[PDB]
Amino acid sequence: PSDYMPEVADDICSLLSSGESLLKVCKRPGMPDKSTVFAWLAKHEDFRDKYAKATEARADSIFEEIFEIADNAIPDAAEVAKARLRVDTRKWALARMNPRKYGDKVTNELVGKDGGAIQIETSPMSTLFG
Amino acid sequence: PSDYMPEVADDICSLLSSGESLLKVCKRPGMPDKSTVFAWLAKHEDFRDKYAKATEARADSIFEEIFEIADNAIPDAAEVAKARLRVDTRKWALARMNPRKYGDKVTNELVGKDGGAIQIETS
Amino acid sequence: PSDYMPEVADDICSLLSSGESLLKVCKRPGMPDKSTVFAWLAKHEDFRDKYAKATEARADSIFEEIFEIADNAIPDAAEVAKARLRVDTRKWALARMNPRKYGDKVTNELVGKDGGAIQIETSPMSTLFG
Amino acid sequence: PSDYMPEVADDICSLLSSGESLLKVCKRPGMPDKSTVFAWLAKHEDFRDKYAKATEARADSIFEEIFEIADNAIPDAAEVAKARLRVDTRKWALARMNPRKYGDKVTNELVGKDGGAIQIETS
Amino acid sequence: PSDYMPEVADDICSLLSSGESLLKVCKRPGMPDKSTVFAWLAKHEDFRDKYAKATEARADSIFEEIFEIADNAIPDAAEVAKARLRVDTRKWALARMNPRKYGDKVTNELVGKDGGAIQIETS
Amino acid sequence: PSDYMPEVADDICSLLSSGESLLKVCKRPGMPDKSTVFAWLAKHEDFRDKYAKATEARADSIFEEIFEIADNAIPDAAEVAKARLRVDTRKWALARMNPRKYGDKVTNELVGKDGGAIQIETSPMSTLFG
Amino acid sequence: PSDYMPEVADDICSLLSSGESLLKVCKRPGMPDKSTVFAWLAKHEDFRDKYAKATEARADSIFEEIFEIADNAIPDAAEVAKARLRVDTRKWALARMNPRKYGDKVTNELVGKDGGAIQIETSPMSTLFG
Amino acid sequence: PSDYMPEVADDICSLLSSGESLLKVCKRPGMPDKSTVFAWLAKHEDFRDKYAKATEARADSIFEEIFEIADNAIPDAAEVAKARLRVDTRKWALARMNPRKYGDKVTNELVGKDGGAIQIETS
């Protein structure tokens, strides 16, 4: 399939939503190749909008999946290394799929010299940087 | 079972709140599948909230789990590597489940050049 | 035991204070299961307050323990890897139990372009972000 | 083939935009070598732009590739190490190809001493 | 021995101040157990302070210890891994015992877009 | 060759531009040693300017090369470790050759206490830090 | 030796200045034990001042030493691991001995939303944080 | 040879400036030992400066060395580990020899809650 087919695009969104990766989806019977999916995306705003929603749902599904990949790892050195790689790749991807939810979280307690106030001295410009 | 139904959603929460993961909750008979749970959440703000607090309770349970996974690890190379992966995955997840509580903690002492005041020039 | 029992809650606080983990405490004779402890926490402010104090003390105990875990590690590859995991898990946990005391510590010397003053240029808003 | 020629440059872009890397594009018959592609870009701002969007499309393709590399890795020590290197290299590259999209994501909660207000003294 | 007693607390400090850890101090005859030492500290601000300076002295001793642990490590895989764990644990601990002295050190050169001035818009 | 030779300097710039390292270039027939190249740089602004341009081009070439080094790694433990080292060294170098293009990229969402506004309290100086 | 001896303290400063560690120095013939050195430090400002100077010099010596430890490492797995540990320990220590010289170095290019200006909105306090 | 002497110090600089390390420079006949070189620097500001530029030239040489160490590493486990240590040590050192040039490079896009403006309240 090369021509845009909304029924197929809808199915793609559903599968992605459930956690499946695009390349894996594109290997299913009657699915377009990844290049074609990207081509559809580029020219159909209805697909793009639903695909963005599916990406959010996809991330929520993957967040649950990482526990299973780790917990069910076959206790063999190479198998554990692969499980680790699969989990690390997902962790990285999740932060990009939904940065607000899955990005890193840090609380910075900001203090100044010797634990006192932050000391700031302002001066007029000394070079032409405007 | 696909139709959004309170009490059932209320059930799932109490389940997660007791430390149970979403997968296990959904593998129970009469329980909606993962996708259905998400669909619900997405279209109901009330469920989003109650689920959120269950998620914070789940985090508190996982926090204690990591000590046990580490301390009880089998002293075999692959098993220790697996335990480390299980712990690392939980640590990462906890920060997302309750960022204010389980996020990273840094104290930054901010000083200026040579430990003097921070020098700023403005236009 | 399912019903809240202050004598038992007090004992829990004492054991945690000494460095023992909750799941380990809950395996002792006559202790409630972890779910029950969390249930007690949720509905009894007297327990919650004493449990928070116990968590602070727990962290101070663990801070001493990490030296022992490392120093006494059996010099076998797997045993050292486990000791490392036990220590790393505690280090991570300590920062969350008492962020002010056990969080990361950084001193940032802040300077500007070419080691001079930090150069700032202010402008009126160019888009509607208010 | 060294002379800057639109349509050919337009071709390369569509090629990269479909996920193909620069090396492969340049190994095709009638295709300028790497150096020539760069020379072009450097002296033509129009090509720099179209190439930039092709680069963002290429990033989107690589983003999906990393899942497959990880999930389909052969369960052998050296092969898993190789797969990890392939993935790590792509992750690093993606942030440079589209920094706004694939860069690191952090939420910093900024507070002052003891969780009070941030204290500043100015001269 | 549970009753808070100066001179005994004064003793512990001088002990820690000479590089000795709390465990060893508490394993001595007539010495309060760990819990008792903490109880004391918690309810006495004077002890909290003297203990704090002993802790800074202890840090200075540990700082020199890490060189010896590294340099004298037995050239065997597991022993080197153990030495690395001993050193890493001490490095992490030192930053907490004296954050101003043993915390991380960074110099950040702050510049704006393209190395120009930092651009800010305010409402 | 010790005396500055523009034809040779031009060749050096071309080879570097294509991704080759300086020490490797300096092993080619009739090339000056690295010390000599640095000596030429120090005293000839025409060379320095063209060398800086070549460094930018060099980085763009290396950015493509890292994919090949990883993808074509011989699946042997030591060979993969070497490929990793070669890639890591290039990643580090690229950020210094063109910091704007190849430096790290972070988006920091800045918030204040409890996810509200960042709370700032200003006070008059309490010590003489001016 | 327990009593403070300036001649011995001077020697200590010289040895440290050259890169030697304190515990190693204290094993030399006729040297005080480390506890004694710290005791001397505590009560003699002349020693403390010269010891601080020696620490700066010590760091400069170690900075050169790390190259040698790495370059001369015996090509055996355990020996390389030990060399790495020796180098890593020194790197960490150097930043604390002279933070200005040997601390981490970062250049942060600060930009705002979508690569434009940093957008700041100020508001009156909404809670009592003063 | 302990007495501070220009031309000799000038010599050392040209030596370092050509990529040679301080150890090798000091192992040459008629060359002051390490300690003497430092003593000099400490008490002479002129030498501190000339040495500083030699140090920046030395950094530029080491920068090219790291490519060769990596690319020419012997494909044996311990040798690759050694090469990695040699490279890592040089990378770390370079940032200290010329921080503006070889320090870390980050671009931070600073935004506020939910990608809106950065919200500040002042007292």
mmCIF file of C-alpha atoms in Angstrom, chain E residues 15-93:
data_model
loop_
_atom_site.group_PDB
_atom_site.id
_atom_site.type_symbol
_atom_site.label_atom_id
_atom_site.label_comp_id
_atom_site.label_asym_id
_atom_site.label_seq_id
_atom_site.Cartn_x
_atom_site.Cartn_y
_atom_site.Cartn_z
ATOM 1 C CA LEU E 15 37.653 9.216 68.716
ATOM 2 C CA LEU E 16 35.891 10.015 65.443
ATOM 3 C CA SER E 17 38.082 13.112 65.130
ATOM 4 C CA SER E 18 41.090 10.794 65.097
ATOM 5 C CA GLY E 19 39.630 8.925 62.131
ATOM 6 C CA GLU E 20 37.775 6.133 63.925
ATOM 7 C CA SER E 21 34.311 5.227 62.607
ATOM 8 C CA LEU E 22 31.120 5.221 64.721
ATOM 9 C CA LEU E 23 30.734 1.437 64.580
ATOM 10 C CA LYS E 24 34.168 0.820 66.103
ATOM 11 C CA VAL E 25 33.603 3.522 68.702
ATOM 12 C CA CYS E 26 30.350 1.854 69.730
ATOM 13 C CA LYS E 27 31.866 -1.631 69.828
ATOM 14 C CA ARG E 28 34.132 -0.547 72.675
ATOM 15 C CA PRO E 29 33.228 -1.579 76.250
ATOM 16 C CA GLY E 30 31.167 0.986 78.157
ATOM 17 C CA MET E 31 30.255 2.667 74.878
ATOM 18 C CA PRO E 32 26.598 3.364 74.032
ATOM 19 C CA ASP E 33 25.216 1.514 71.017
ATOM 20 C CA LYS E 34 24.639 3.342 67.730
ATOM 21 C CA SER E 35 20.992 4.057 68.526
ATOM 22 C CA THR E 36 21.914 5.632 71.852
ATOM 23 C CA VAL E 37 24.520 7.872 70.238
ATOM 24 C CA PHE E 38 21.859 9.079 67.784
ATOM 25 C CA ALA E 39 19.186 9.519 70.445
ATOM 26 C CA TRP E 40 21.646 11.739 72.316
ATOM 27 C CA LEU E 41 22.523 13.883 69.295
ATOM 28 C CA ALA E 42 18.830 14.311 68.451
ATOM 29 C CA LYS E 43 17.940 15.716 71.878
ATOM 30 C CA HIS E 44 21.142 17.692 72.530
ATOM 31 C CA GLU E 45 22.167 20.544 70.227
ATOM 32 C CA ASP E 46 25.550 20.905 71.947
ATOM 33 C CA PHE E 47 26.502 17.337 71.071
ATOM 34 C CA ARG E 48 25.206 17.812 67.517
ATOM 35 C CA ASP E 49 27.768 20.573 67.056
ATOM 36 C CA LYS E 50 30.849 18.928 68.583
ATOM 37 C CA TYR E 51 29.987 15.759 66.695
ATOM 38 C CA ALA E 52 29.782 17.800 63.488
ATOM 39 C CA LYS E 53 33.386 18.988 63.800
ATOM 40 C CA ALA E 54 34.531 15.480 64.668
ATOM 41 C CA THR E 55 32.768 14.437 61.467
ATOM 42 C CA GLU E 56 34.747 17.017 59.504
ATOM 43 C CA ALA E 57 37.980 15.748 61.081
ATOM 44 C CA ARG E 58 36.951 12.183 60.240
ATOM 45 C CA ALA E 59 36.470 13.302 56.615
ATOM 46 C CA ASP E 60 40.000 14.692 56.482
ATOM 47 C CA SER E 61 41.325 11.296 57.620
ATOM 48 C CA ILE E 62 39.250 9.349 55.114
ATOM 49 C CA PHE E 63 40.498 11.662 52.355
ATOM 50 C CA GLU E 64 44.007 10.351 52.911
ATOM 51 C CA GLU E 65 42.781 6.768 53.287
ATOM 52 C CA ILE E 66 41.426 6.670 49.729
ATOM 53 C CA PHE E 67 44.909 7.105 48.230
ATOM 54 C CA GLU E 68 46.190 4.135 50.207
ATOM 55 C CA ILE E 69 43.218 1.924 49.332
ATOM 56 C CA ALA E 70 43.743 2.650 45.631
ATOM 57 C CA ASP E 71 47.542 2.463 45.542
ATOM 58 C CA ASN E 72 47.805 -0.661 47.692
ATOM 59 C CA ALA E 73 45.002 -2.627 46.023
ATOM 60 C CA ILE E 74 45.840 -6.279 45.359
ATOM 61 C CA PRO E 75 46.243 -6.751 41.555
ATOM 62 C CA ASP E 76 43.451 -9.342 41.382
ATOM 63 C CA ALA E 77 40.109 -8.750 39.624
ATOM 64 C CA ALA E 78 37.803 -9.127 42.633
ATOM 65 C CA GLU E 79 40.193 -7.342 44.990
ATOM 66 C CA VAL E 80 40.480 -4.362 42.636
ATOM 67 C CA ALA E 81 36.676 -4.290 42.290
ATOM 68 C CA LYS E 82 36.438 -4.320 46.098
ATOM 69 C CA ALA E 83 38.997 -1.531 46.455
ATOM 70 C CA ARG E 84 37.065 0.502 43.881
ATOM 71 C CA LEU E 85 33.862 -0.008 45.896
ATOM 72 C CA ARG E 86 35.636 1.018 49.113
ATOM 73 C CA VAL E 87 36.975 4.171 47.471
ATOM 74 C CA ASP E 88 33.724 5.072 45.722
ATOM 75 C CA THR E 89 31.792 4.717 48.959
ATOM 76 C CA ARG E 90 34.239 6.982 50.771
ATOM 77 C CA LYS E 91 34.209 9.603 47.989
ATOM 78 C CA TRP E 92 30.430 9.762 48.118
ATOM 79 C CA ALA E 93 30.433 9.932 51.911
#
